[PDB]
């Protein structure tokens, strides 16, 4: 009840900023998450004993893969934290509750492989879930953990509030399927520009939460350059392994997953910034003006990649 989490001064200040790095001390990450829940949602949103036991069960169900790991989960939750804190009044009590949990849970039991590889391998999950394969799995895992004894952090919610929060988390997690981002942002762009965007329209809120999820999920590109560059190494460590496994099935992977084409990384990053990242944080800034620092950091990192190609680094 009266037990607050308190970070060291440097973390207490920098955790509020969009570009915050949660650091290499894994044992501090649960406390960092709890701190963000208490300030974003309240010290009463969850029973501390249940929340702590939810967190540690979520952690256990993240694998030791180079990128799609426990650090990613907490990193994506912090970006959401920074969005919710800078947009205090735009989001309901249920939404702030559901979205930090959704981000922590969004990649549960990731194996370091794309939906496309599961399909080509003929993985059992690809039979169970024809589209957004891993994302349907991530939500399934989230429900399973919530249903463990002592793990139901939403127990104090009514039946309709419980169905509402689980529906927010499901849409939120399915939205992290990048395949769905392109159409979602296009719809949002049209709605913003024709002035039809309406935050009291539930279908519109869903779309806006969807784009927030893409923005938080890609937030590697919104860090300071050294963090962005070193996270790229972990991302490519997974992709190149997936490319190796494509070659094992007798399929040439796309250049992005082919370690033989490491040289093309800098130009690959430009395409990704221009095609995915900048449009994402631009549409997000239009809808939620105070998320401008994410767009600004994204553009700074595009500039850094342009310098790599020009042999300036
Ligand atoms: C955050 C982030 C950072 N980097 C990437 C890699 S983007 C990328 N696109 C291409 C296209 C061709 C290509 N040829 C050699 S490397 C390479 C690429 N890397 C993805 C990413 O997001 C995924 C994790 C969704
Ligand atoms: Mg994912
Ligand atoms: Zn993710």
Keywords:
313 residues, mainly alpha, binds ligand JY3, binds magnesium ion, binds zinc ion
Summed up, what is this model?
This protein has 14 helices and no strands. The protein has 313 residues and is an all-alpha fold.
Mind sketching the topology for me?
Elements lengths: L8 H6 L14 H12 L7 H13 L9 H16 L7 H13 L9 H7 L2 H5 L4 H15 L11 H16 L3 H16 L8 H16 L7 H24 L16 H23 L4 H18 L4
Helix pairs in contact: 2-4, 4-5, 4-11, 5-9, 8-9, 9-11, 10-11, 10-13, 11-13, 13-14
Magnesium ion binds next to loops.
Structural commentary:
The chain is mainly alpha-helical and 313 residues long. The chain has one domain: 3'5'-cyclic nucleotide phosphodiesterase, catalytic domain (Catalytic domain of cyclic nucleotide phosphodiesterase 4b2b), CATH 1.10.1300. It is built from 14 helices and no strands. The protein has helices spanning 9-14, 29-40, 48-60, 70-85, 93-105, 115-121, 124-128, 133-147, 159-174, 178-193, 202-217, 225-248, 265-287, 292-309. It starts with 8 loop residues before the first helix and ends with a helix. Magnesium ion (MG) is lined by residues 107, 134, 176. A divalent metal cation 2 binds at residue 107. 3',5'-cyclic AMP binds at residues 68, 269. 3',5'-cyclic GMP binds at residues 68, 269. It comes from Homo sapiens.
Shape: globular
Radius of gyration: 19 Å
Main sheet makeup:
none
Q: CATH topology, anyone?
A: Catalytic domain of cyclic nucleotide phosphodiesterase 4b2b
Number of helices: 14
Along the chain, the helix and strand elements come as HHHHHHHHHHHHHH
Tally the beta strands. 0
Provide the domain count. Answer: 1
- The CATH C-level name is Mainly Alpha
| Helicity, as a percent range | 55-70%
Helix/strand/pairing category = mainly alpha
CATH architecture: Orthogonal Bundle
